[PDB]
Amino acid sequence: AYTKISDVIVPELFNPYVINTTTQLSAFFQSGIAATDDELNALAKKAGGGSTLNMPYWNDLDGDSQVLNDTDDLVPQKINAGQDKAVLILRGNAWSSHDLAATLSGSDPMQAIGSRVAAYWAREMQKIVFAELAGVFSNDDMKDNKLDISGTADGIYSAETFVDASYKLGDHESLLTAIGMHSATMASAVKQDLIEFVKDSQSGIRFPTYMNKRVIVDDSMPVETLEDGTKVFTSYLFGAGALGYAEGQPEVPTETARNALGSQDILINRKHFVLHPRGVKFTENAMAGTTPTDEELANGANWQRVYDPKKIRIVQFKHRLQA
Amino acid sequence: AYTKISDVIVPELFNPYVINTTTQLSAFFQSGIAATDDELNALAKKAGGGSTLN
Numbered sequence: 001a002y003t004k005i006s007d008v009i010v011p012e013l014f015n016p017y018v019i020n021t022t023t024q025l026s027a028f029f030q031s032g033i034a035a036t037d038d039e040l041n042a043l044a045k046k047a048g049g050g051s052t053l054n055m056p057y058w059n060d061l062d063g064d065s066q067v068l069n070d071t072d073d074l075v076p077q078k079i080n081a082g083q084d085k086a087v088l089i090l091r092g093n094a095w096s097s098h099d100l101a102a103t104l105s106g107s108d109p110m111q112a113i114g115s116r117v118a119a120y121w122a123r124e125m126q127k128i129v130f131a132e133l134a135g136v137f138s139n140d141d142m143k144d145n146k147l148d149i150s151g152t153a154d155g156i157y158s159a160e161t162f163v164d165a166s167y168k169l170g171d172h173e174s175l176l177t178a179i180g181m182h183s184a185t186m187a188s189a190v191k192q193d194l195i196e197f198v199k200d201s202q203s204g205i206r207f208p209t210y211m212n213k214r215v216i217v218d219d220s221m222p223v224e225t226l227e228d229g230t231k232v233f234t235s236y237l238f239g240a241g242a243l244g245y246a247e248g249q250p251e252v253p254t255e256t257a258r259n260a261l262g263s264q265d266i267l268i269n270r271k272h273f274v275l276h277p278r279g280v281k282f283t284e285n286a287m288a289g290t291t292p293t294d295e296e297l298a299n300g301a302n303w304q305r306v307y308d309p310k311k312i313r314i315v316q317f318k319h320r321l322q323a
Numbered sequence: 324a325y326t327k328i329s330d331v332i333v334p335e336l337f338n339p340y341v342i343n344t345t346t347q348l349s350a351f352f353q354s355g356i357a358a359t360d361d362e363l364n365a366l367a368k369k370a371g372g373g374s375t376l377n
């Protein structure tokens with residue numbers, strides 16, 4: 001058909017392009033990390049492959065002073081040690097196309113299919129991490145200091161409960177940046193409050209703002225239902241700075257192959273990456289595997305945290321939607 | 324069959340320690356107390372040690 005950079009498969013000149021555009025286009029960003037610690041490098045790249053390491057830490061000395069008084073002596077004190085974990089995950093999928101369609105629309109090879117696949121993974125992470133918090137951080141007594149709800153049919157989501165939730169970190173404020181928002185909410189928001197369209201990029205328009213924050217319109221969210229048609233939403237609020245990840249490399253990032261007896265040709269991607277909040281430690285219990293983790297069971301149960309209280313940093317409030 | 328990751332040996336990993344912080348931010352300075360006068364300069368150093376003057 002054409003020069004076919006992918007269909008005659010130049011593996012160079014292509015894969016770096018795809019990865020980078022995948023990074024910039026997707027947002028989030030930021031919010032979350034850019035270029036996390038090389039810790040996740042040593043977990044990602046070869047050599048010393050996964051699964052994940054464990055890294056330690058020394059909590060700070062603490063204790064009372066003692067009465068300094070003669071005719072008595074002192075007693076010394078000690079330090080402790082602690083543990084931390086991460087995970088590693090793998091992904092991939094195919095494409096069933098016929099090169100007739102792929103470069104039918106594609107035509108000029110460079111921008112077309114690359115831009116597409118980029119936009120693809122851009123949504124993929126947005127699905128995976130946003131699923132990663134989901135069960136864990138909500139289900140425990142251990143985080144409850146970070147969850148408050150107005151639910152059970154008195155609460156409005158406006159102008160007050162938002163503030164109080166935003167102060168659920170007592171001393172530490174003004175580290176928070178982005179507000180995760182499902183659509184219908186922000187609908188109820190434009191219906192009432194002052195939510196203020198702010199134009200930064202000159203000249204471009206614009207990312208919406210609530211109060212010195214960046215709200216984020218996001219399609220896929222949790223939602224539940226009770227009887228009596230009453231609804232409940234989640235809408236995480238963090239803008240922490242940050243989560244973390246590092247890209248890492250597989251072998252054969254791009255592969256082109258075809259089948260003689262039928263008529264097809266297909267594509268594959270299969271990228272590695274390492275992402276996890278630091279944040280709670282990860283463990284192994286009562287799960288399948290391994291590795292990588294999962295989706296479902298990579299959420300449903302069994303995480304364990306140690307810091308604790310501050311510098312997590314994420315908070316959730318389930319609120320009912322305004323009448 | 325396969326190369327089959329199940330049957331090949333995986334190492335594990337570590338890397339250096341990092342100090343952890345404990346947080347309750349202690350400032351409550353400046354305030355009383357701060358920026359002292361010299362009366363206590365007379366009650367601190369030797370000679371003529373404590374206890375307190377009047």
